Design a protein around this ligand. Structure first.
Ligand SMILES: CC(C)(C)COC(=O)CSc1n[nH]c(=O)[nH]c1=O
Length: 252
């Protein structure tokens, strides 16, 4: 679902294609704001299981005490807030692909349960001793340095070596050549649709700035910048005065 054919993304696309035909776990890393879910979905889409579900669990966007419920499900009354019975991500993903995003947010107890599940396919809903099984292809992702997490005792060593089979390091936006403006154009059209505007082009100074700035927040930061421009301005062309801070200030 990536845009562009920059040299470093070509390498990513070759690994996606080759990995897609295997069930081996993929382990994605990259700087803040790189497209980890886009990569995971591309692997699923290229795989023989593309017609089955792709499910992404963002472990950070769930309270830590509730990741297990989100992942494995829960029976009614399993814990104080369990108003009903819940199907876990692993069931939603059966015969498909499960992306565990921000995986290092899981506590060590949950990591142990995840490792059993990865080894066997077996799991239990929270609040239940009954065993179930599913078949999922795993893709993991993290913004942390997963090796560092292991060294500091926050991530299980056995889990790391079980998961770290096909690593993919996503290129940061500043290294992606012509992709930056191709992505910016796609965002410009989408945000214009969202906002009821009609931006269609960037001036030459804006192109130069977008192609020289370091984008420390990568594609998320680019999305913010295009959103800012389209929300605050009405024109067909993005002009340099429209670019928000601190893009220019930091650039210099
Ligand atoms: C406009 C569009 C929906 C394509 C934007 O999507 C995102 O920005 C997702 S993250 C991403 N998308 N495409 C890339 O080439 N690299 C990315 O990181």
């Amino acid at each position: 679902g990536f845009i562009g054919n920059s040299l470093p993304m070509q390498a990513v696309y070759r690994v996606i294609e080759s990995a897609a035909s295997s069930k081996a776990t993929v382990f994605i890393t990259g700087e803040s704001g790189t497209g980890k879910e886009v990569c995971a979905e591309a692997i699923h889409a290229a795989s023989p299981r593309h017609d089955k579900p792709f499910i992404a669990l963002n472990c950070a966007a769930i309270p830590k005490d509730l990741i297990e419920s989100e992942l494995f499900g829960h029976v009614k009354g399993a814990f104080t807030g369990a108003s009903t019975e819940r199907q876990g991500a692993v069931e939603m993903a059966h015969n498909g692909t499960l992306m565990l995003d921000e995986l290092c947010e899981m506590d060590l107890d949950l990591q142990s349960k995840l490792l059993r599940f990865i080894q066997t396919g077996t799991y239990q809903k929270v609040g239940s001793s009954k065993m179930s099984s599913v078949d999922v292809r795993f893709v993991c992702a993290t913004n942390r340095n997963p090796w560092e997490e292991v060294q500091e005792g926050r991530f299980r060593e056995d889990l790391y070596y079980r998961l770290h089979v096909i690593p993919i390091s996503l290129p940061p936006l500043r290294e992606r050549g012509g992709d930056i403006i191709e992505i910016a154009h796609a965002l410009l059209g989408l945000m214009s649709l969202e906002e009821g505007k009609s931006f269609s082009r960037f001036s030459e100074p804006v192109l130069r700035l977008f192609e020289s700035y370091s984008w420390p927040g990568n594609v998320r930061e680019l999305q913010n910048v295009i959103r800012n421009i389209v929300v605050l301005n009405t024109d067909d062309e993005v002009k340099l005065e429209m670019v928000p801070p601190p893009i220019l200030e930091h650039h210099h």
